[PDB]
Write a protein that binds this DNA or RNA. Structure first.
Lengths: 100, 50, 18, 51
DNA sequence: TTTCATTATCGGAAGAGATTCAGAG
RNA sequence: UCCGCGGCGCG
DNA sequence: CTCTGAATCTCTTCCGACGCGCCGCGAAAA
């Protein structure tokens, strides 16, 4: 029922939301056309986790994924986004998993 | 100058210039050579008990 | 090829794609 | 040097430029482990450019 | 049967390949 | 400012 | 009756004088 086992080193059982089937499905078909996938969710731990879940639902290889953060809508921002990017942070992700 | 390519590619003359030197060297018809070259099929380099 | 970008809010996406 | 600051060029320049574009595109695609479909398509395009 | 928080809604000729027809066993 | 193309005419 | 080899067809590949005046065009990028 919980979807997590406190007695087995916190192994969990995530599963797509009963109302996001379409959303997740469209990314899977669209993923082949895209060369390099850019996860641009919020920099906080919740956003970081959404990025982590996307990466594990779309599959592929780590190198095919990149993490970018958009400052503002201004071109002086959407540009710098792909300029000095990075990848997802595990510590941040695990912090959110701990809270959840 | 020179350019170094990520993946090799054939030289057009040795295929289109009839008779195809490549095909007759390989004892394979040119049609198949074209199909594999432009990535329409696969060909077996090595097969043992397969 | 084409790059795939993913954000959280749809409204924000439409704005980024622009 | 054409009049008005423009230029007249041989087609060879266009062919070489297209080949360079395809080659650099292929390498930048390859170095990040893209799905096989697009890499094969771009390899085919590069072969076409060479031809 | 059942509880939590989070995110955001031309024509002509030659050559090569493929197909078919006739002769043999 | 060196090139190519399109048309026209001369033999 | 069934297969193999040669002929026949279909598809592909080349190549169609040589000089020389004119004319007016070619390309843009953020």
């Amino acid at each position: 029922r919980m979807g997590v086992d406190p007695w087995h080193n916190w192994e969990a059982h995530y599963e797509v939301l009963p109302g996001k089937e379409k959303v997740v499905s469209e990314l899977k078909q669209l993923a082949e056309k895209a060369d390099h996938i850019y996860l641009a969710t919020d920099l906080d731990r919740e956003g970081e986790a959404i990025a982590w879940h996307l990466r594990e639902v779309i599959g592929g290889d780590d190198a095919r994924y990149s993490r970018v953060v958009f400052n503002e809508i201004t071109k002086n921002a959407i540009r710098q986004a792909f300029n000095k990017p990075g990848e997802l942070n595990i510590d941040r992700v695990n912090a959110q998993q701990a809270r959840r | 100058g020179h350019i170094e390519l990520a993946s090799p590619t054939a030289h057009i003359w040795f295929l289109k210039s009839l008779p195809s030197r490549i095909g007759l060297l390989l004892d394979m018809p040119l049609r198949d050579i074209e199909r594999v070259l432009y990535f329409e099929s696969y060909v077996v380099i090595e097969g043992g008990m397969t | 090829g084409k790059a795939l970008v993913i954000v959280e809010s749809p409204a924000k996406a439409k704005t980024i794609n622009k | 040097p054409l009049d008005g600051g423009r230029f007249a060029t041989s087609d060879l320049n266009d062919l070489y430029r297209r080949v360079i574009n395809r080659n650099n595109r292929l390498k930048r695609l390859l170095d990040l482990a893209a799905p096989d479909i697009i890499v094969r398509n771009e390899k085919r395009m590069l072969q076409e450019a060479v031809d």
